[PDB]
Structure formats: C-alpha cells, structure tokens
Amino acid sequence: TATGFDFELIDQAGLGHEKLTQARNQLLAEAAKHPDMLTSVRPNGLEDTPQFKIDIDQEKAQALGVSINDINTTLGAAWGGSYVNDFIDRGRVKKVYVMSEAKYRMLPDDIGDWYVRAADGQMVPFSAFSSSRWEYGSPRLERYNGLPSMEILGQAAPGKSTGEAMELMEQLASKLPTGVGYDWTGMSYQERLSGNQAPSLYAISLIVVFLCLAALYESWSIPFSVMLVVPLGVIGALLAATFRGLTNDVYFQVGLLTTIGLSAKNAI
Amino acid sequence: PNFFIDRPIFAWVIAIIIMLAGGLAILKLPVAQYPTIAPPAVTISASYPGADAKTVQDTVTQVIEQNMNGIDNLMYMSSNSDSTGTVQITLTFESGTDADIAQVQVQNKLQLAMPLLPQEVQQQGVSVEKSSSSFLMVVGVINTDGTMTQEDISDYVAANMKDAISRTSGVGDVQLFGSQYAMRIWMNPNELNKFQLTPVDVITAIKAQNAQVAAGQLGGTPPVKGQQLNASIIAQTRLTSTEEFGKILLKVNQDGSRVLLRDVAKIELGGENYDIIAEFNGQPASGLGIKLATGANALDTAAAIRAELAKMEPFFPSGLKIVYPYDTTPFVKISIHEVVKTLVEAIILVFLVMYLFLQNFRATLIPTIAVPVVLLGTFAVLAAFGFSINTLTMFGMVLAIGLLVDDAIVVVENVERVMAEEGLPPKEATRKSMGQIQGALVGIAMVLSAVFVPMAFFGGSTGAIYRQFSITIVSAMALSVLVALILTPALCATMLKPIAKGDHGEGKKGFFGWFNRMFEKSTHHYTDSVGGILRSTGRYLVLYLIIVVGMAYLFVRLPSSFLPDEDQGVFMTMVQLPAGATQERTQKVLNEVTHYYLTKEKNNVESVFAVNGAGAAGRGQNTGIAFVSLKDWADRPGEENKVEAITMRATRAFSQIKDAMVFAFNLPAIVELGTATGFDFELIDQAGLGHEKLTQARNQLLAEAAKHPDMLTSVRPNGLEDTPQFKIDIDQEKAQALGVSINDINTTLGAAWGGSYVNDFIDRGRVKKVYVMSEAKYRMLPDDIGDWYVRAADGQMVPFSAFSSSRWEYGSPRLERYNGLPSMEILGQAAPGKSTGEAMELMEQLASKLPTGVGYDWTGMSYQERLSGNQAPSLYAISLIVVFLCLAALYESWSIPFSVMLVVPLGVIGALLAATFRGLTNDVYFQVGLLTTIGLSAKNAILIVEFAKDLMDKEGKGLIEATLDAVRMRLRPILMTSLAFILGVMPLVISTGAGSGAQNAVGTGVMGGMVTATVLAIFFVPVFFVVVRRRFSRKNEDIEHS
Amino acid sequence: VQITLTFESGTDADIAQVQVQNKLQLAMPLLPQEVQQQGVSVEKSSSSFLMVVGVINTDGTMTQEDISDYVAANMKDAISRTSGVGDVQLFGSQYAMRIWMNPNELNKFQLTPVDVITAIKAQNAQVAAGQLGGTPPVKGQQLNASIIAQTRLTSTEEFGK
Amino acid sequence: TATGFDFELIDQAGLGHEKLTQARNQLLAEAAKHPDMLTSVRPNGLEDTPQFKIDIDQEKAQALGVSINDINTTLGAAWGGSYVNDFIDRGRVKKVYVMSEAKYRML
Amino acid sequence: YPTIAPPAVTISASYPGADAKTVQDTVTQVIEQNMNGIDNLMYMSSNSDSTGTVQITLTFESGTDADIAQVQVQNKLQLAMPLLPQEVQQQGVSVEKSSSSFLMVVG
Ligand SMILES: CCCCCCCCCCCCO[C@@H]1O[C@H](CO)[C@@H](O[C@H]2O[C@H](CO)[C@H](O)[C@H](O)[C@H]2O)[C@@H](O)[C@H]1O
Secondary structure (H helix, E strand, C coil): CCCCCCEEEEECCCCCHHHHHHHHHHHHHHCCCCCCCEEEEEECCCCCEEEEEEEECHHHHHHHCCCHHHHHHHHHHHHCCCEEEEEEECCEEEEEECCCCCCCCCCHHHHCCCEEECCCCCEEEHHHCEEEEEEEECCCCCEECCEEEEEEEEEECCCCCCHHHHHHHHHHCCCCCCCEEEECCCHHHHHHHCCCCHHHHHHHHHHHHHHHHHCCCCCCHHHHHHHCCHHHHHHHHHHHHHHHCCCCCHHHHHHHHHHHHHHHHHHC | CHHHHHCHHHHHHHHHHHHHHHHHHHHCCCCCCCCCCCCCEEEEEEECCCCCHHHHHHHHHHHHHHHCCCCCCCCEEEEEEECCCEEEEEEECCCCCCHHHHHHHHHHHHCCCCCCCCHHHHHCCEEEEEECCCCCEEEEEEECCCCCCHHHHHHHHHHHCCCCHHHCCCEEEEEEECCCEEEEEEECCHHHHCCCCCHHHHHHHHHHHCCCCCCCEECCCCCCCCCCCCEEECCCCCCCCCHHHHCCEEEECCCCCEEEHHHHEEEEEEECCCCCEEEECCEEEEEEEEEECCCCCHHHHHHHHHHHHHHHCCCCCCCEEEEEEEECCHHHHHHHHHHHHHHHHHHHHHHHHHHHHHCCHHHHHHHHHHHHHHHHHHHHHHHCCCCCCCHHHHHHHHHHHHHHHHHHHHHHHHHHHHHHHCCCCHHHHHHHHHHHHHHHHHHHHHHHHHHHHHHHCCCHHHHHHHHHHHHHHHHHHHHHHHHCCCHHHHHHHHCCCCCCCCCCCCCCCCCCCCCHHHHHHHHHHHHHHHHHHHHCCHHHHHHHHHHHHHHHHHHHCCCECCCCCCCCCEEEEEEECCCCCCHHHHHHHHHHHHHHHHHHCCCCEEEEEEEEEECCCCEEEEEEEEEEEECCHHHCCCCCCCHHHHHHHHHHHHHCCCCCEEEEECCCCCCCCCCCCCEEEEEECCCCCCHHHHHHHHHHHHHHHCCCCCCEEEEEECCCCCEEEEEEEECHHHHHHHCCCHHHHHHHHHHHHCCEEEEEEEECCEEEEEEEEECCCCCCCHHHHCCCECCCCCCCCCEHHHCEEEEEEEECCEEEEECCCEEEEEEEEECCCCCHHHHHHHHHHHCCCCCCCCCCECCCHHHHHHHCCCCHHHHHHHHHHHHHHHHHHHCCCCHHHHHHHCCHHHHHHHHHHHHHHHCCCECCHHHHHHHHHHHHHHHHHHHHHHHHHHHHHHCCCCHHHHHHHHHHHCHHHHHHHHHHHHHHHHHHHCCCCCCHHHHHHHHHHHHHHHHHHHHHHHHHHHHHHHHHHCCCCCCCCCCCCC | CCCCCCCCCCCCHHHHHHHHHHHHHHHCCCCCHHHHCCCCCCCCCCCCCCCCCCCCCCCCCCCHHHHHHHHHHHCCCCCCCCCCCCCCCCCCCCCEEEEEECCHHHHHCCCCHHHHHHHHHHHCCCCCCCEECCCCCCCCCCCCEEEECCCCCCCCHHHHC | CCCCCCCCCCCCCCCHHHHHHHHHHHHHHHHCCCCCCCCCCCCCCCCCCCCCCCCCCHHHHHHCCCCHHHHHHHHHHHHCCCEEEEEEECCEEEEEEEEECCCCCCC | CCCCCCCEEEEEEECCCCCHHHHHHHHHCCCCCCCCCCCCEEEEEEECCCCCEEEEEEEECCCCCHHHHHHHHHHHHHHHHHHCCHHHHHCCCEEEEECCCCCCCCC
C-alpha cells in the first residue's frame, strides 16, 4: 500500500472489539512522537457509524389485516430496491430495478409518507407499528488469519530508507494490552523474509566455497588464506552504502555476494 | 576413477561434504507411518433428512447417475442410498493418478444435477471429497465432573475447536463426532390439536417471523441535492436465544390471549441430531476424527495439534478435559526408534566383526569410517528424490548395510593381502588392487542395480513399497560402489598402513588372539578341500540337483501374504444388534463391553471409546463401535498381553453367550488393503429388475457358493439384511372429500415423525440450524398415528385414521449401487488353502448360473488385482535376465556369468529353510529379502570367480590351480562380509516391539538366505566355475599363457 | 442451445472443462427454470463423432422408441463415463410417461392443462417420511422400522387412474 | 478441408437479426462477383423461416377474470409440452411428459 | 517481476443490506472452517462489509499453482459451503483467483 510496509496488528487473545480499538488508537497516537523515523502514520478499516433501528411490532399489524411479507418487501423496494426480471435493451440483456424515487428516502420522517395495503383495502402508516432509535454499528470488520486486526499503515520519514521505520514499528508495538501482537504482511512480510536470512545464506554459502576451494585445486590452508579476504570486500561496500544513504536490502545483498565473489576469485 | 587416488583431500572434501549433505538432508526430512500407499478415491455424499431407501436412491441418487457423466480416469462407482437420507458414492480410482483432477471434475458435474435434486438436499448441499478411512486421529472431548452432556460437548466442539486447533502446522481433514446445536422445537399434537393448528402454520410462523430483512438506506443512492446525511436502515432481525423463540406469535384469539409458540410446543437449545452416541468410558463424550496433511509430518501434526489443544485447554470450560483414545503416533515414534536402534546395533556388530578380523586400529577404523559417509550421504540421495523416510525405506537402509560395507570391505582386504603378496608401497599395491578389482565393484553395481531396479517398476501398493527399497538400497549401492571409486580407494591408499611382501600375522601376538593362524590354518583345510572336491565333480553336480529341487518343493509349501499383522497399541471391537432393534439394546452392549475391557483385561486396557449408532455396514441404532486403547508397550509383556490373544479372548468371550453378533478384532498394517485370499463380489442387476429379485439372488447364490468346502470360502453378505418397513398408504379420495390439503397432510406427517429443518438462528455469534420435530411420545408408537389432526379448508381437524391404511412390508435399509445401476455387495473368500482366483473361477461359475439381471462384476479389492495380475513372474525373470546379461557384460562372455548364476539356489534354499522353520511367509518382506539374497549370492561368486578368470586370462594360469588360489585368497573376504551381514541383520531377526512382524520378516529371510548362500557357495562356486568353463573353447586347455 | 468453447491447443483439457462448469454456477441461479429443471450438460468433446454402434430389431416388431429404450436401460450410463467421452448423441430416445391431452374431452369436464399439471405434480411423488421409534426414542422401545409413504408411480394403470 | 474458410460476420453495434441477415446477403452476392478470388461462397446455416406470433391482448383477459399465467402455461404444455414429474419404470427412473395429443396441435 | 506474491482465491457475493458481523461470521469465516488442509497457504485476509458485498480472500504460497489452488480450495470452500447464506447463493457469486493490483484501468 506504500513505502515498505503494511503493518498488520493481530488479535490473538480473547479480549474485545472496544478494548482493542482503544489499544490501537493508543498506538497511532503514541507514535506521533517520532519525526526522526516515521512520517504519514495512518489507520486501516472503517470505524463505527450511527445506525437507525426500526422495530416493527408484529401483533398490532397481525390484527389490522396487513400481511408481513407485503410490509417487508415494500420497506425494501422502497429504500433498498428489487431485481425482478430482465429486459432486452438494443439487442443486449440487462436488469430491471423498481426502487422509490429520491426525495422519499433520505430522511427518517419520509417513512411516514409510506403506507402498506392491508387485506381489506385500507393502507396503514408505519407509525402504526414502527419504533425508531439511534444506536451504533460497525460496517466492515477487518481480519488477518481470520481474527480481528488493524493495519497501521505508514511510510518512512523523508530522512532516507524504509526499514528503520519498520524496526521502530517493532518498538512501538511493545507497550499495549495483554493479548495484542505484531506481524508483517505484503511488502514488509518479504522484508521479514529477505532480512532474517543473514545467518543462513552465510552459514551455508561460506562453508560451500571453502570446500569448493580445498577441492579441485587442493589443500588445507588455501581456503583459510583466501577466506580471510571476505571482510576486505565488505567494509567498503558497507563504507560506501552508509556514506551515500542506503540500506541492507536485496540489492545490497546481491551487491555484497558479488563483491566477496570477485574478491575470492583474486585471492584464488 | 583411478584419478582420485592421487587427490586424497579432494576425496575428503567429497566425504565431509556428503556427510553434511546427509545431516542437512535429515533434519527437515519427512516421516510417516508408511509411504502414501493406497489408491486414491473420491466420494460424493448428500443429506435428505428423513427419506426412505427408495427415496434417497430415487430423488438424489438416480438423477445423479444421470448428470455427472464425463469425468476422466473412469474406474468404478460404489454407492449407498442409506435409508437415513445419506447417499454416498465412492469412485475408487486407478493407482497414483492425480486426485484433485477427479475431485473438481466431479464437483462441477453435480452442479449439472443440482436443480435436479430435491430442495431439502438442494438447500443442504452435496459434497465431493477425496477420501480414505485412514484416521490419523480420534481425539475425544469429555468433562470429568459431569458438567456437560453429549450435545454440550458437541456444541463447544463445533464452536471452539474446529477453526483454531486445525490451524496447527500439519493438518488435512476435520470430522466432528456428535451433533451441532440447533434450535430444537418439540411439537405437542394435543396442544396443537387444541387451537386447530398444524405443523404448516407453525412452519410458516417461524419462517415468516424469523430472519434479517432487506433494509434500505437513508440517503440512498442516488440521493438528491443539498443532502448532508447518509445512513443505514436496520430491520427485522434473526433471533438469538430460546427465549426470543417462545415469545413468538402464531395466532391471536378473539378474546385477546394470543397463542405463542411457547404454548403449542416445547423449547430447548438442542442438538441437530440424536443418531449417534459417543461414550468415553461410559461417561458423556463427543469426539473428533483427524486426517494427516498433504506431505505433512505425522509427529509435527502431533506436536502442534497437541500444543494447540493445550493452548485452549485452560481456555476451555470447567471439567472440560481433552482426551486421546486414538492416535497412530506413538506406534510410529517408537517404530522409528526401534529401527534406528537395530541399525545402531548393526553398525556396532559389523564393526566388531571388522575388528576381530582386521585387528589394526586404523585399518579397522577405515571401513568403520566407511559407513556414515555412505548412509548420511544416502539420506541426501533421498531428500532429493521427493519420497519420505518411513519405517519401510529406512528399513531398506538397515537392510542395505550389507551391500554397503561389502565393497569397501572387500577392497581393504584385497589391498591388505596383495600387500602381503607383492610387498609394494601402500599406494601402489593399493593401485593394483583397485585396478584388478574395479570389475568386482562395478560388477556388483551393475547386478544389484540390476535386481533392485526391476521391482521399482512393479505395480500396486506392494510395488510402490518396493520402490522405496529399490531407491534406498540402490542409492546406497551405487554410492557405496562410487565411494568405492572416490572415497574408499583414496581412503585405501592413504589412511591405511604399508605392508611388506608376506607379513601374515600368524601367532605373532599372544594376548590378542593367535586366532589368525587358525583362520589361516583352517583355510588350508578349506583350500586343500576345494581341491579335493574339484578332483571329483560328478558328486557335486548331483547334490546341486538336490538343493535345486528342495528349493522348489519347499517354495510351494510356503504360503503367501500382502503385508504382516501389527500390534499397533490400539485396536477395536465392533457391535451388531439384530434387524430393527433400537438404540437401547445396542447401548446395553457398549457399556457391557466396556465392562469386559475394564475388568477381565483391566491391566491392558487404558481407555474404551463406545460408539452407538453407526458401525460397519452403515448407520443404524442397532450398530456399534469400540476403540480400545492400551497402556504403552513397555508394560505389556507376554503372549497374553499383546493384541493377538486379547482379540482372541474378546471375541471368544462374546460369540456364544449373547443374542447379537459382536466381534472384536485387530487392524491391518497398511491402513487399507487387499483382503488377501478373497473378494467382494458385486452382483449387478442389468435387466429391468428390482431390489426383491437381487435379494432373492442373494439367497440363491449365498446358497450356491457356500456348498463347496473344497474351493470357495466365507459366503457372507456385508451390509444390513432385510428389515421391517411400515407402509402407510393414504387413500387420497377421502381427503379430496373432507376439505383437507395434501401438502398439509404430508408436511404434517413429516414434521411430526421425521422432522423438518425450517430456519436459521444465531447462537452465541454463530449461525446454526432451527429444527421443529414432534415430541417423543406423540410419534414413537404405531398407535400414535391417531393423535395427529389435519385442519381442513372449512375448519375442523381430521385423524390420520380417517384416510390411512397401515401395513408391514419388507425392504433392505442400505441400497447399494455399482455404476448407477442396481447392485449388491457379496463379500467373499477362497478357502484358506485355495488361491483366491480359483475361487473366482468357481464363484463366477455359480453367479453365472443366475437369472437374467443377476450378473457378476468386480469392485474394490478384487478389481485392480484382476487387471494387474499375471505379471510377477515376468519382472523377476527380468531381475534375473538383467543379472545374466549385465554380468555377462562387465566381464566379456556367456559361460562366465552362468557359473555365478548357479549360486541363487544356494541362496534361496536358505531363505525358505530358515523362514519355514519360524513360520513366516512369502510376502513382501520375504520377497525383498529374497532379491537381496540373490544379490548376496552373486556378489560372493563375483569375488571368487572374478579372480580365477582374471588369472586364467591375463597371467594365463591353469583353471584348477587358479580356482584354488582365488578360492584361497577370497575365502577370507567372503567370510568377512558374510559375517558382517548375518551379525548386522540379526537384531531385526529377533526383536519384539513395534512392527516386529516387519523386522522379523526382513531379517529371517535375509539371514538364513545369506548363510546357506555362502556356507554352500564357497564350496560350490569354484566347482560351478570349473565345470561351467569346461564346455567352451578347445585350445586352450588348461592355459599357461606367459 | 449448444455452446462449444474451443481451447488453446495442448492446454489442460480437463482443467478447462471443469473451470467451465464452476463458471456455469455464477450464471446458473438466474437461469430459466424449465432449463434448470431439464439440466445442462458440459462435456469435453472432439469437433466430430469418433464412433457409431447401431442396434436394430430382427423381426422389426419394435419401434424406434422401443429399441431406444432398451439402449437406455442396459448400456448408455457409462458410455458418457469412459475416460474420453463428452456428449453422446443417442440415436433414439429413452421412454417417458406420455400423457396426450385431448382438448375436447378436457373442455367437457371443466378442466384445462393447468389443472392437469398441478394434478399430476401433487399426485405423483415420494414423500417426506419418518421413522417408527424415531430417534431419539424413550425407554423400553423395541422398534425401528422404515416408514414408507406414497410412492411415485410405476404402471400405465396408475397414470390413468 | 483444404484451402478455405469459416468466415464469421459478427453484429457489433446492435442492429438485430434483420440488418445482419441483409448485410450477409449483400456480402454473399458480393463474393459471387469474383470468380477470380473465391469459390462456393455459401452461407452455412439456416435462413429466416416463417414464424407465427400469437400476440396476447392482455386487457381483454384482465377484465374477463382469466389469469394470464395459466393461459401461457396452457398454450405451452399444449403445443410445446411440459416436464412435470419423474416415475419408475421397471426399476429405472424416466420422465413425465404431458403434451397435447397429435391432431389437436398441427394446423 | 516474477510471480512474487503468494496466491489467493477471492470469493465475493451480494446479500443486499446485511450487517458487518453477519457477513463476517455467516458469510466470511463460515468457509475458512473447512479450509483445513490447504497446500502452501501464507496468510488469510477477509471482509464482511456493510453494503451487501461479502469478501473471503484465502491467501497461499508463491507458485503453489493457481488453477491448482482454485482446484483444492474452491473444493475446500465447497466443503465449508453449508454455513453461508442462500440469499448470498442466489444472487451472482464469484469465486475468482485474484490479485488486488489493477494491472490497468482504462478510462
Ligand atoms: C549338513 C549336511 C550337508 C553339508 C555338507 C556339504 C558339503 C561341504 C563339506 C565338504 C568337506 C568334505 O568333503 C570331502 O572331503 C574332501 C574335501 O571336500 C574331498 O575328498 C577328496 O579326497 C581325495 C583327494 O585327492 C580324492 O582324490 C578326491 O579329490 C576326493 O575324494 C571331497 O570329495 C569330499 O568328498
């Protein structure tokens, strides 16, 4: 979604909707204290809007001779709408929609102007069965691995590089509720993956050219003598990368592997 | 090749690198029980709640037998239109074809049949599933302090287990044992007769009144200008408790006392089904059945699933403790340790021989160094081949130790001795040894690869089983041979000490066994002796004919197998109550069984799992199942405490002292197999007939094949026999008069006695079903037909006794199919001592002689085993023909490979002989053993015969004297190797504990085979060789060639 | 209606064909109901007939429709299931219960087609049954037996009556 | 089948069956006018045959107290036919069809 | 770039007007329950949504073959299939292998 990451904040425990929301605004407000590492820290999801509850009381209408199906459907097709059948426009199939007009469906009182025809032949106002209130609700509930989560979106401050901001993220996600954890997905997921490889590729590949060297062109000491050369290759690649403004990424890794490469050739 | 002799470190690099290739190839290497062995099948099932046999066959089943036409890799279609509403079609497919291909093909050919379903199915789905019966696990859930009962456990099971524990790293399929909660509404026909109300008005009540609904939106799009608000309409909402459902309005009386559902019927948050009952040691329990994941480890599915269950275990309710009645894990954990263990012993024993013969610390160590580089590096050969290190393949390794060390060993000997016969420096005498015995090692490579390959190209489950050894012992072979071109030769020249010409060691040490002379003294006896026989050939020709012949007769009188039987730490006993009995009598049997195990075998049994309601043939209150788990293997000693005698005395206990057929038994090794001497005859109705006629055919034929005690065996049906059904024919005339509506009569009859799935509600935050069934007592006794009244069009009720005739006819409750057409499952077998196919010939002759629409056809076990049948002779003729031509090749003739081929009988006659004594069987493990024996025999003959012909040629010596020299100098190695083998293989041979059926089976055939092979070949081969060559060429002669 | 989708050569055949049928069900619920009730068959197929086996009656005393029935009664269930067959066009037709409405004799008795339909629908079906001693029963209970119900018809008699 | 084709003229703007019929005719005559490039330029298929509209005056039926739904389904099951239920012949399922009789739907 | 991102099958449907927790715990996590046994899964993303659109995005390991994925997974959903709504099941339901990256948008 941006520069380096898409921090995913994961629910693991059995805590709650409210409380978690409080823990995260806690983090998004707790991080505004870092201009030397972060910039444009923003939240992901839809929060919680005002909902308009309309309870229809079945008894009062179950007398009056109006049928429930009819009242439901009319309320619907009025403010939602309906797919009936299909027609043939210009030589192409399309849908058919029957919804109310505009002005009778923007404000609650317009409910009034709506009457349901009973079994006898007289209409009934909704104000004959509908209590109405202002309560609250959520629209779109986010998850990561099926469980409640929030992507604290961000980019690194204009002060160069992307990963230091991610490591600083790892320091933010510490001081919050018992059951509130951290993970990376997408751009920084792989930045978890191409990062903590440093021990393994070098645990292995270093041992391999060692034996490759004691091999076809023989000896014991020859791989040691040549192998002391590896630091000499890096300290300049490290020296330069710092001097310019870069970061230990992939391109620096291939940059490195390559550099130790020609260098080992030479001592070879 | 020779080249790496003068690059010792380069060699070293190959050694330490390959050993590491090993360790890295081990740490993340997969382990299973066996390799994925069984042919894959996909099954289709559907649920038609309340239907009868003819119904789920005739509404769901037959419209299907018509619309999923055209899936590839067609094979066969077996089906059950259960008279419980389940319809189940198992397509069992051709071995090793890719499953998933089938699976999607089918799921998208049912959606062709989908509108052509009934609508209660159509709303309740149809499932297509790749399938086995191989439960990795059955995990029980119980509460200790009687806190919850089966439906509570079941509900929690469905709400708190199946999404987060099955997130654990290592898991395939999940299956719940019990029933999910559903809103259970129990209608009383009295309190429903009262207010003239019937199920339909109730149906319509809960349906219309209980849901979410099409809302709409304030500021709906497209709104109109000026607008400064956008917001969502809420509406009629689905319900939540048992409370919100009693308060539901059905009809208001004119007096004003409204009638809610709470009145006419009873309300509990209940189960979606009350078929099967799950008892953990009698106490209430509900369970889970788990299958392993797609290339996943069994033991890590175990580490993570059991860690996961332990992660929700305090976060479980009170008393709620998880249980493990059924795991196939410790059997495997312990299988592995026992097999490594034997291998460890094998290593140490081999090394012992290796010392107590070579007696030089650094020379005795070189071939000991020989072993890790070879195995560890073989694991590297496996990690790259995409198969798994299971019991069997790693068994191929423990078995392979012999064909490993043999080469390396021979070389250390040949060098040590040449160094005793030419005096040259370590490296040079070595060089000569390597250049002269190249043929020994490349030869063995040529023929063992030649004998273990032909099996890999075999078919079936047993064939794949073979694939595993092929690769292990051949990789082991080739690498041991190839280490013998890079590793062993450089290790030979370099880490080995230099000898002057003729050092011999004879009684040149006292405390360390003068021993060597004896060997040397003895080989004089040996050597003069071969000469003695060489002088007098005819005798030895004849006696050979003896061994051959004996080998033959004896081969016959050794009985086959498909795999050995295994104490798995877990076995089961199943229950069967006579037709139409109820759940109650069965439950009597389950806890009575539980008594037997916790009492008269109290010490052995740890936990019983009693299942009431569906067992073998199908689902059905009269049918039961028990999982009996034992205390860990360490605490079960004797003959009496192991699965065998336990099963024996269990079924002994129950057969003659009960009214019901109830049998205890032990599960196979392989979690699905050919039932050996036998079949599962499918009797196919082809002509326009019907169920009555096939059944009469079952009578006819079960009478026709059971009347031959000399060919046929176990004429029995597998299924449930013919049950009592109660036809209630409604005479429509009368009701088309009285003003009652047919839909009203039907759906009321249903919702009363079967029941109806009507709507959905939301318990605890999870959607579940809403069920309205009548109550117990108003639809359990025939007499209750009465208490039910239909509200007419005018307004008064009618009894069912106003239109309903009522009788008892016959039907089978489990309707079978074979390819969409009417069929019947006759399981059957050949006499214990008749081949199964002979029984196929006489059974086909009876079931041929049956009415036209009663035919014969094959399914399951006897199917594949019919097409892929007449081939084993051909491939082992190949393993042999590859032996004869490949070694005719490494040398350069014909007569010279014959002399080495003469040894296989000396080898065979030993595997029969030792095995026959024990009681083992010409199955697979004895077969792999047999091949290996062939290898051994030809190996040794390679040793001797190679040296004699070489001399004959290139130094031109005389036959008899050359055979004698070879025979003399090669005695010593032949013996070293062979002792290493017998002693290495031994532990397997006598070990008890996991799979010892396996260990013993490999071991015995292999051991006895090796013994007679050598202890006879070292006296026959030189006479094989001499006479064989004496009928080819003219001049020479007995060669002097300078 | 026959819609033939021709795929890129050497493509996975079956993967294609199946992909097709799980895109049949995005458009399938909003289909006509006379169709949905008369099935649609999606079948991987050549662009021509590979083979035709004929069947005839020796004494000729069978009609196209008779022979055709026999085909449908003993063989043509697996010919579309051989691991290489798409649609088979059956030369004939399997039997159907044929009710031939007489429009005079229908004006006679105050009934029209609509009434004939709802008539035969309702009169001809299986029915939601149940079980004597149904589960879960109560103690002492000693019976479980199959409730049969009205059964769909079988003869020419059941359909005239 | 040697050197040839299977030309598809696809209607793209949405001018319905008629304009397509005529464009194709225009074309089919336009290719018969070049024997120095084409041979057997023929359309493959069927042309436009005589069809018989039974246009319903819904009104006359909307006073008269008849329900249209039934009227349709009657014309249908009469001259087309109707798949209604399934039955069991000799132990094997088949279909249930109610179509008019022969002589009562041919002229 | 190469096939870099882990493979996901997305399911989307319309339940016109429903709420967040219905389409989260009736429509979304109602499938992810039989999604035990997936080949090479990396992570799981999901939407409830309050306009009637419901989204279940199941995400697997790079190169784990898509067509293959929809194989095992559309057939692991079509096993988790019973706990979703039927008003969902009647109006346009898509199972489609997905990225979230418009390769292009043409105006
Ligand atoms: C357990 C029962 C079966 C196991 C026995 C299988 C055979 C292995 C035993 C070999 C040892 C006895 O072998 C017997 O003594 C020696 C050496 O072999 C030979 O005896 C020889 O003595 C002189 C020596 O010139 C004769 O000229 C001639 O060469 C031969 O008669 C053999 O002809 C044999 O008859």
